[PDB]
Amino acid sequence: TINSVDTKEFLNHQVANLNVFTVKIHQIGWYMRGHNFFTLHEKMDDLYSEFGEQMDEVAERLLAIGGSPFSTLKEFLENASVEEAPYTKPKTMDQLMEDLVGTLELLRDEYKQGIELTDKEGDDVTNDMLIAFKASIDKHIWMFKAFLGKAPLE
Amino acid sequence: TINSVDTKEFLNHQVANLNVFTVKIHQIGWYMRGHNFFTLHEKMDDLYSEFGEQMDEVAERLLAIGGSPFSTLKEFLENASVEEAPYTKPKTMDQLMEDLVGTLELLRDEYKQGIELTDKEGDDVTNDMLIAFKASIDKHIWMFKAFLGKAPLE
Amino acid sequence: VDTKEFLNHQVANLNVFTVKIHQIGWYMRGHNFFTLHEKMDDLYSEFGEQMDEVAERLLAIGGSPFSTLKEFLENASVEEAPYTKPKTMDQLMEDLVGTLELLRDEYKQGIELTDKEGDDVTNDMLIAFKASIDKHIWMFKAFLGKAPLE
Amino acid sequence: VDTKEFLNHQVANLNVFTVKIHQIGWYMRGHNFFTLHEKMDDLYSEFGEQMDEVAERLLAIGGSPFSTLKEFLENASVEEAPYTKPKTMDQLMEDLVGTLELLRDEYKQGIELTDKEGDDVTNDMLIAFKASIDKHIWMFKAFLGKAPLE
Amino acid sequence: VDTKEFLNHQVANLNVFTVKIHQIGWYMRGHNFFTLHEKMDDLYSEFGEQMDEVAERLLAIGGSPFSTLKEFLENASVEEAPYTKPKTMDQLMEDLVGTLELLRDEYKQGIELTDKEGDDVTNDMLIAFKASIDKHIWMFKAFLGKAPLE
Amino acid sequence: VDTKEFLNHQVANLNVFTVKIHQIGWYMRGHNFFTLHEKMDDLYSEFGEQMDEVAERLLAIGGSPFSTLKEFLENASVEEAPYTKPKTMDQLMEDLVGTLELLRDEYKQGIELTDKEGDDVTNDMLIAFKASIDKHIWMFKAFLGKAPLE
Amino acid sequence: VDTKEFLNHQVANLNVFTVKIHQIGWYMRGHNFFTLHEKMDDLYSEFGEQMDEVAERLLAIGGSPFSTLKEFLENASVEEAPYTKPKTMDQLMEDLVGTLELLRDEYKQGIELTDKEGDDVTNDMLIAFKASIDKHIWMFKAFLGKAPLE
Amino acid sequence: VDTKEFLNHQVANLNVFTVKIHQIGWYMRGHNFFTLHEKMDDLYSEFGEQMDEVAERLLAIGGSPFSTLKEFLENASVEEAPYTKPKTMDQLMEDLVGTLELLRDEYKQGIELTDKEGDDVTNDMLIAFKASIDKHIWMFKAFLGKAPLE
Amino acid sequence: VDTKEFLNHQVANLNVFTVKIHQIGWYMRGHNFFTLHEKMDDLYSEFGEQMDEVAERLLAIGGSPFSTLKEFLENASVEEAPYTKPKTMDQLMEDLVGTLELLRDEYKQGIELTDKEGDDVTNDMLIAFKASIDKHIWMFKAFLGKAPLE
Amino acid sequence: VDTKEFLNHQVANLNVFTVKIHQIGWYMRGHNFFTLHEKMDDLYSEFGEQMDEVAERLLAIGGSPFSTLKEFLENASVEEAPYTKPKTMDQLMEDLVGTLELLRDEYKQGIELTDKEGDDVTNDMLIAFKASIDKHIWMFKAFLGKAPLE
Amino acid sequence: VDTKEFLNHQVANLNVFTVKIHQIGWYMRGHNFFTLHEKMDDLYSEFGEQMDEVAERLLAIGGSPFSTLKEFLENASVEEAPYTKPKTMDQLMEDLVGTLELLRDEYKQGIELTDKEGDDVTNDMLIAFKASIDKHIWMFKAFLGKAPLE
Amino acid sequence: VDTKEFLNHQVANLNVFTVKIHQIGWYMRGHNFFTLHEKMDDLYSEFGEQMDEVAERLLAIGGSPFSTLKEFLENASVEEAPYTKPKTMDQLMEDLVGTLELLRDEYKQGIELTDKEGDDVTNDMLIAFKASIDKHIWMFKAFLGKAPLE
């Protein structure tokens, strides 16, 4: 059974995703415990600011193409494919990083869909914007997978 | 009929509030139109970062007092007294600023409750943290009310 | 028009635009003077930077950039008019947005052309420039109480 | 009045002016609040800096600067009034402009006087201050929808 | 006196004080000229910053700050005198310390008043200012070969 | 103990703590060496800054800070031991957190005492210090796989 | 010619000159490319800054600056030619030097005129610009193996 | 060759190139020593940065970068020769340009390959690097008195 | 071996070492990835800087530095191996430490030799490099849970 | 005494000295308070940095630095006394100078010992510290109206 | 004497002065050593910059600056004497002030001469230098407990 | 000659050298003017700093530095000549190089002497200076198309 997504709808979906992600980054940064706390907490603060910057750029690009960004938590929750769960039972640093990596992978793959879609639509600016963001996501995937003792695509 | 709030619960409520507020600041910054766009959009970007900083400080103070911050959009929405609405019908710059001022006023008054509560509980650090934040909120109230051609407490 | 001719055309355009940005910044009056004068100074620097990068990219692909005011005037599609009768801030901003739109649409032609010719570098350069132009269109349209594409 | 007396007069003037700048920055209301409030803080700093330079030039030429509010009040030609009735942004800016023009014209008298007395340093100092005042007059007049000398 | 009246009184006080700091910095002579003139410039900035913060805090609580030299003179408890007879560096520093002590003690009154009124922000603001004043008192008393509270 | 005696006690404590921070930074071994050695250097600077501010605040209230190692040892409640037998990173961090906790609880006594005595400045100073200590306790406890207050 | 007309003429000149500086910077070849290309970029910014200052000074004196390429071409004494046949670095530098000398000499006329009219600010502005031009003439003549006035 | 093999080839190439840049910077003699030695240092940093970015991109796509000098020599198309007989600045720059051209052309192959594979990130990375290479080609050809593609 | 030969040997060594540093930084996995990867980037830069300084000192003493990968490989005592089988973080750090120790000991031979030859500059240069190596050995040995000379 | 024991002795000395520098900085009174208090703060940081470098050098040579106040007191040749009776600025500076001379002379012993043992790094480290000490001796002796070695 | 001869004379003077500033900074002793030694370093930089600017202005006007110590000695009106008998800080400052006054007065002659010759740039240059000299005279006279022109 | 006499001789030398550097920077003409003029300004600052460090080291060892041009002329081995007949850039660089070699060789004598006398600080100071001189010799000889020791 079917459905269609344009550049505007793709961008708006990422506004929702990024907002869930950035809140998740904070969850990880706040609740983490273990020997790697100092470096990883700092790392979460860096990702929080970077993905918040991506979010704002996505929303403002959406604005520039005549779109209307989701701008409430209700709308972000109703639209995001990025999943969130309250922090209840204690999680290992590895478990937290696996959740982080899984979401980075989700965003990478969705951005790839976005890159293809925007190429088809001839939206070169949005296309290049998404490529630049994927570049950074790919680097983070390599690094965080390495933290987990894994290959980037393993 | 009754209910009680301690420092932990007050802080957690503000984590929820600040997250709704910061998203609202972005809504205002994104959707604003009119002669004051450049200065006010920039101003929204500044408030976004400032209130995001307050939020993180509130959550990390909560952590430091043995609390568990809300860390999902679901939890922020379920707990916030700060109200949000999707941007549907066009709003004037004044209307957007009135929504901003109203939320600043809400936070100021809640922070005052928080200041009194934390004073009673003997949590001096949280008390001073909240005072410093109220100081900034009061300054913003004066300025934004002045933008609206109004006295700070009018 | 090839990539070389497109680039050279933008060297001409950007030089007219940059002079127009100064006109607007110099002659503007009204309540938004301080913020918009500063914004004109920013745009002047940015579009002057675009111009030099266009001209130097042209050089790098074996071209010969226009390098006189006579050549810029003879070749530009961006229009200029002396400042005679007083214009409102909105009228000045409408001239600015109109020129931004002209540049955006011409750059889109340049993006297509350079993609056809397989000039990847010029392509990416023009895309980055268009990105900034699009942001400016949204903001300046917003100043005018309008949607970016209205 | 000689150079010493002229400078001392400006010490008095600038102290009234900086206090007026603050009044305008504190009491202003309206849509241009953010940019104009910030602009008042910039002017406050600039004119405070001119003031200190004037007083220190006066010291360097063997003078004795006024250094009390009583002395500033007794000597200044720049006028001040308490903020009672609400003033529009335009009214506050007209008050600012009027004071800028007063200072410009007095500085011109100072420039002439100092040239006649052969005090080349004080002369150049006054010229550089006038330069800034003239720029401010253009910009603030432009904010008011007026020509600089209108 | 309430918080608003206390704040407004300090706006008056700080404006007299900053002018005094300048008097001291301008007229000082002796072996400690270089370091103490620089120190006067630092204090001038600091106390002018406190003044602006007091006035803006007053604004934020629904007050109306004094904004003319006439109002500052009419209301200040900080005393000023024109520089007539030459003063020793020590005498200038004694005048400075005496004023710092006056402000510290009045701020202490303000801290207690604002605590009673439940104006937590103004309270903290005044405490932070007192902190700095206390440090200055120690240092300048030490320059005078005295204990801070001697 | 009064405010003066409490402050002087912290001058002693902070001097022992700062030397302990160096011990930990110097003797630490294990996988977290680079991040934790750097963190010890940061804490050394921060607690050295706290110490000087405590001592200078004491000076400002008419006190006489301890200013010899003999006096610090004679007065500190913070304990020190020479580094003899190898300690794990966790053991070093437990000593650090224990000392942070000691300081937090003592500062809380200081906060109460200084509130009783009406020394508002010292009160706020100690609160700001406690704020930082609390943040450090959370972080270092988190490193140890523990809740801040467990 | 009055001050306004002199200033407006320089707006035109500087716009032609800045475009010429880019011509030289873009088309230059030879062993001194890196140093001289960079030098052209610096001169471009500097003369662009003089131009804006001249135009804004003109505005401040009640003038109306030329603000189109058509106006600059129709009014400039500074000459331009398209780059057709290859020029030596020396030839490009001789064109640069010649234009600097033209501007120096015209500015000298402007200095004298502005002195006659009693426009002290414009006078000082033009002198400061001449100072820079004279320094560039010395250096670029030295590059050419010549004395500054040879 | 796939993206992984192309990237790995460039890791080899860039490591030979950076070493060559150093050779040129170390052994150069003549009148353009100062500017060109500095330029070699800039290129060394830039190309070492490209190398690291290529290797890290390779890592990010599941590759395994060459990470020994043996591997770089075994795989590079960029040629190296020990400095024996003295070379002119021009000859050193010709070797530099020739290598820049080799890299540009291979990057062009990489841009097309990665476009076909749908590796958008690697594609953009290579385009950005080519952009810089093209600018260098123009500039160094200009130093050699040549057109960029001559 | 003389000073020239010793230096040239270190040019070879440092080039193998920097490439090894990158290998370690690229291929590392485990919990210490973030801090150690960053540490590898720092060491890469530092040892690259030592390398350039060694080569340039060699130039300054009339020497001819190795300036090809072939020459570095043929001359280095620092060993390299391709990354094939997965290595633990400890194993990678042991490889790093071993190379640091090799360099330290060779530098010591260099320090002795250069002292005997009376090359005071090269002597001091080597001493300063050893200082840094010794600090690194302590820190990396500490990471490995070992004493510096264990 | 060997290098390790010499270094460890200096760890002790520098810790006593740094505390003494604070004693002087805190208790000083007189006309030179501002300059000298600041100077004490600079010396505090500098000697604290020497101390950490000595301790870390000790670590790098397989040593175990003293890392408790008890150890510093039991091993230091630098003497300390509590501040009881008021001291003149000169008296405080004489205590400072005497301790600098003590450290200079001991460092000279350390330089000779370290030269004998062939510990080139520690040698150079101690020489660089002596250089600074000798500069401070000249300056502080000059403050006291004395020749450096008088 | 013309502008060229006047300028060349100041090249001579400033070179003697700068060397004198160093004499004063090197040989000074007494309580004000730290502040005044630093002040001498500041003056040395400033007057060295004036010197270079004078010499380069001379170059720009077709002159030939003195560029040997022999020429500076043969031409300077500024007097120098070897430091033999110990001088008081006041004596050293009196020599400084005397030379500052000499320079001020000669610059005043230069200002008049250059105005007569219509050398506007040199005129403004000398005025800016005098400005600073006058400020230094006020400050150093104040140090000596004297009025600037006393 | 002892350390004190050697140092004082270099105070003399560096002052002649610095004046020579300015001569070269002022009078130079030719294609390399921009790069080399800037290089002269860099050398002037560097050798002026060496000079001050030499003089202050002399002070620290109980010496009395030459502090007049008469003393520098009477004592310097570095030769100076007025600029009369035009010199080639190469001729000027040959004079620079020759003086750098003179200084290097005398510093080498100073290094030996100071090692004999056991003045470790002066020794290291001179070595650091030689380090830079050697680097300059390599670079300037390379400019002249020569090997460093040729």
GROMACS .gro file of N, CA and C in nm, chain G residues 83-147:
model
  195
  991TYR      N    1   4.211   4.384  -2.047
  991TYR     CA    2   4.336   4.310  -2.061
  991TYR      C    3   4.325   4.224  -2.186
  992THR      N    4   4.405   4.263  -2.285
  992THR     CA    5   4.409   4.199  -2.416
  992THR      C    6   4.545   4.133  -2.436
  993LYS      N    7   4.645   4.214  -2.473
  993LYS     CA    8   4.781   4.164  -2.494
  993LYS      C    9   4.853   4.145  -2.359
  994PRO      N   10   4.931   4.033  -2.344
  994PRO     CA   11   5.004   4.008  -2.219
  994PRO      C   12   5.095   4.123  -2.177
  995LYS      N   13   5.089   4.152  -2.048
  995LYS     CA   14   5.171   4.256  -1.987
  995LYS      C   15   5.269   4.190  -1.891
  996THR      N   16   5.387   4.250  -1.881
  996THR     CA   17   5.493   4.215  -1.788
  996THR      C   18   5.445   4.259  -1.648
  997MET      N   19   5.500   4.197  -1.543
  997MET     CA   20   5.475   4.238  -1.404
  997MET      C   21   5.509   4.386  -1.387
  998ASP      N   22   5.624   4.428  -1.442
  998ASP     CA   23   5.669   4.568  -1.441
  998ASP      C   24   5.569   4.662  -1.504
  999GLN      N   25   5.513   4.622  -1.618
  999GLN     CA   26   5.412   4.699  -1.691
  999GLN      C   27   5.284   4.715  -1.610
 1000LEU      N   28   5.242   4.607  -1.544
 1000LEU     CA   29   5.125   4.609  -1.455
 1000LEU      C   30   5.152   4.699  -1.334
 1001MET      N   31   5.270   4.687  -1.275
 1001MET     CA   32   5.312   4.772  -1.163
 1001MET      C   33   5.327   4.920  -1.201
 1002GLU      N   34   5.373   4.947  -1.324
 1002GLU     CA   35   5.381   5.086  -1.378
 1002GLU      C   36   5.241   5.147  -1.392
 1003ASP      N   37   5.143   5.066  -1.435
 1003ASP     CA   38   5.001   5.110  -1.446
 1003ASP      C   39   4.946   5.139  -1.306
 1004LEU      N   40   4.984   5.055  -1.209
 1004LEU     CA   41   4.942   5.068  -1.069
 1004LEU      C   42   5.000   5.197  -1.009
 1005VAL      N   43   5.131   5.215  -1.025
 1005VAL     CA   44   5.209   5.333  -0.979
 1005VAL      C   45   5.155   5.464  -1.036
 1006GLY      N   46   5.131   5.464  -1.168
 1006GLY     CA   47   5.074   5.579  -1.242
 1006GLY      C   48   4.940   5.621  -1.185
 1007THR      N   49   4.856   5.522  -1.154
 1007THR     CA   50   4.723   5.548  -1.096
 1007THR      C   51   4.736   5.598  -0.951
 1008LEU      N   52   4.828   5.538  -0.874
 1008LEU     CA   53   4.858   5.587  -0.739
 1008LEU      C   54   4.902   5.734  -0.743
 1009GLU      N   55   4.992   5.768  -0.836
 1009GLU     CA   56   5.041   5.906  -0.856
 1009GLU      C   57   4.929   6.001  -0.894
 1010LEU      N   58   4.839   5.956  -0.982
 1010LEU     CA   59   4.721   6.031  -1.023
 1010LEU      C   60   4.637   6.064  -0.900
 1011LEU      N   61   4.606   5.961  -0.821
 1011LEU     CA   62   4.528   5.975  -0.699
 1011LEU      C   63   4.596   6.064  -0.597
 1012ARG      N   64   4.727   6.046  -0.576
 1012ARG     CA   65   4.808   6.132  -0.486
 1012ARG      C   66   4.793   6.280  -0.522
 1013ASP      N   67   4.815   6.310  -0.651
 1013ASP     CA   68   4.810   6.447  -0.705
 1013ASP      C   69   4.671   6.508  -0.696
 1014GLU      N   70   4.569   6.430  -0.730
 1014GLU     CA   71   4.429   6.473  -0.717
 1014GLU      C   72   4.390   6.496  -0.572
 1015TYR      N   73   4.434   6.407  -0.483
 1015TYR     CA   74   4.412   6.419  -0.338
 1015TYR      C   75   4.476   6.544  -0.284
 1016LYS      N   76   4.595   6.579  -0.337
 1016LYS     CA   77   4.666   6.702  -0.301
 1016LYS      C   78   4.577   6.823  -0.339
 1017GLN      N   79   4.514   6.819  -0.457
 1017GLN     CA   80   4.420   6.923  -0.502
 1017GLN      C   81   4.304   6.929  -0.403
 1018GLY      N   82   4.250   6.811  -0.369
 1018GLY     CA   83   4.141   6.797  -0.273
 1018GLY      C   84   4.175   6.849  -0.136
 1019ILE      N   85   4.297   6.824  -0.090
 1019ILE     CA   86   4.351   6.873   0.039
 1019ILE      C   87   4.350   7.027   0.042
 1020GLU      N   88   4.403   7.088  -0.064
 1020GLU     CA   89   4.407   7.234  -0.079
 1020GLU      C   90   4.267   7.296  -0.086
 1021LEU      N   91   4.179   7.237  -0.166
 1021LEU     CA   92   4.040   7.282  -0.183
 1021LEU      C   93   3.959   7.278  -0.052
 1022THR      N   94   3.971   7.166   0.017
 1022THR     CA   95   3.906   7.137   0.142
 1022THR      C   96   3.956   7.230   0.256
 1023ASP      N   97   4.086   7.264   0.252
 1023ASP     CA   98   4.150   7.361   0.342
 1023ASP      C   99   4.089   7.502   0.317
 1024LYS      N  100   4.075   7.539   0.188
 1024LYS     CA  101   4.013   7.668   0.144
 1024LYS      C  102   3.868   7.681   0.192
 1025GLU      N  103   3.792   7.572   0.176
 1025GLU     CA  104   3.652   7.567   0.217
 1025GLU      C  105   3.628   7.551   0.368
 1026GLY      N  106   3.736   7.525   0.443
 1026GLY     CA  107   3.730   7.505   0.587
 1026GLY      C  108   3.661   7.373   0.626
 1027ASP      N  109   3.675   7.271   0.541
 1027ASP     CA  110   3.620   7.138   0.572
 1027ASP      C  111   3.736   7.056   0.629
 1028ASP      N  112   3.758   7.075   0.758
 1028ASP     CA  113   3.866   7.013   0.836
 1028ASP      C  114   3.865   6.861   0.840
 1029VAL      N  115   3.746   6.803   0.855
 1029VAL     CA  116   3.730   6.656   0.857
 1029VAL      C  117   3.772   6.595   0.724
 1030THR      N  118   3.714   6.644   0.615
 1030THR     CA  119   3.746   6.593   0.480
 1030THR      C  120   3.896   6.611   0.452
 1031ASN      N  121   3.950   6.726   0.495
 1031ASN     CA  122   4.093   6.761   0.484
 1031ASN      C  123   4.179   6.651   0.546
 1032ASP      N  124   4.158   6.625   0.676
 1032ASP     CA  125   4.230   6.519   0.750
 1032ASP      C  126   4.213   6.380   0.692
 1033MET      N  127   4.093   6.350   0.643
 1033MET     CA  128   4.060   6.221   0.579
 1033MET      C  129   4.148   6.200   0.455
 1034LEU      N  130   4.152   6.303   0.370
 1034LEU     CA  131   4.231   6.304   0.247
 1034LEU      C  132   4.381   6.297   0.272
 1035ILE      N  133   4.427   6.364   0.379
 1035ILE     CA  134   4.568   6.362   0.418
 1035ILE      C  135   4.610   6.219   0.458
 1036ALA      N  136   4.529   6.155   0.544
 1036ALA     CA  137   4.554   6.017   0.590
 1036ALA      C  138   4.560   5.921   0.471
 1037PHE      N  139   4.468   5.937   0.375
 1037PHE     CA  140   4.470   5.856   0.252
 1037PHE      C  141   4.595   5.882   0.167
 1038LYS      N  142   4.636   6.009   0.159
 1038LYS     CA  143   4.757   6.048   0.085
 1038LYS      C  144   4.881   5.982   0.146
 1039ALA      N  145   4.888   5.981   0.280
 1039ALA     CA  146   4.996   5.918   0.357
 1039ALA      C  147   5.020   5.776   0.315
 1040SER      N  148   4.910   5.701   0.302
 1040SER     CA  149   4.912   5.562   0.259
 1040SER      C  150   4.959   5.550   0.114
 1041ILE      N  151   4.902   5.632   0.026
 1041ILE     CA  152   4.936   5.637  -0.117
 1041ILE      C  153   5.087   5.664  -0.137
 1042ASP      N  154   5.141   5.762  -0.063
 1042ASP     CA  155   5.283   5.796  -0.068
 1042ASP      C  156   5.374   5.681  -0.027
 1043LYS      N  157   5.330   5.605   0.075
 1043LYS     CA  158   5.401   5.486   0.120
 1043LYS      C  159   5.400   5.381   0.008
 1044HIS      N  160   5.282   5.355  -0.052
 1044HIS     CA  161   5.269   5.261  -0.164
 1044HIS      C  162   5.354   5.304  -0.284
 1045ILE      N  163   5.357   5.435  -0.316
 1045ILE     CA  164   5.439   5.488  -0.428
 1045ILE      C  165   5.586   5.454  -0.403
 1046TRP      N  166   5.638   5.485  -0.283
 1046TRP     CA  167   5.776   5.449  -0.248
 1046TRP      C  168   5.805   5.300  -0.271
 1047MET      N  169   5.719   5.214  -0.215
 1047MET     CA  170   5.738   5.069  -0.221
 1047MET      C  171   5.730   5.011  -0.361
 1048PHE      N  172   5.625   5.048  -0.435
 1048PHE     CA  173   5.606   4.999  -0.572
 1048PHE      C  174   5.712   5.054  -0.669
 1049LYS      N  175   5.753   5.180  -0.650
 1049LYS     CA  176   5.866   5.238  -0.726
 1049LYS      C  177   5.993   5.161  -0.695
 1050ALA      N  178   6.015   5.128  -0.566
 1050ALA     CA  179   6.131   5.046  -0.522
 1050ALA      C  180   6.128   4.909  -0.587
 1051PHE      N  181   6.010   4.847  -0.597
 1051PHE     CA  182   5.990   4.719  -0.670
 1051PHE      C  183   6.041   4.731  -0.815
 1052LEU      N  184   6.008   4.845  -0.877
 1052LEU     CA  185   6.047   4.881  -1.014
 1052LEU      C  186   6.192   4.929  -1.030
 1053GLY      N  187   6.267   4.931  -0.919
 1053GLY     CA  188   6.408   4.973  -0.915
 1053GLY      C  189   6.426   5.123  -0.929
 1054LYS      N  190   6.322   5.197  -0.891
 1054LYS     CA  191   6.318   5.342  -0.903
 1054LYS      C  192   6.301   5.412  -0.769
 1055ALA      N  193   6.344   5.539  -0.765
 1055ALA     CA  194   6.323   5.630  -0.652
 1055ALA      C  195   6.172   5.664  -0.651
   0.00000   0.00000   0.00000
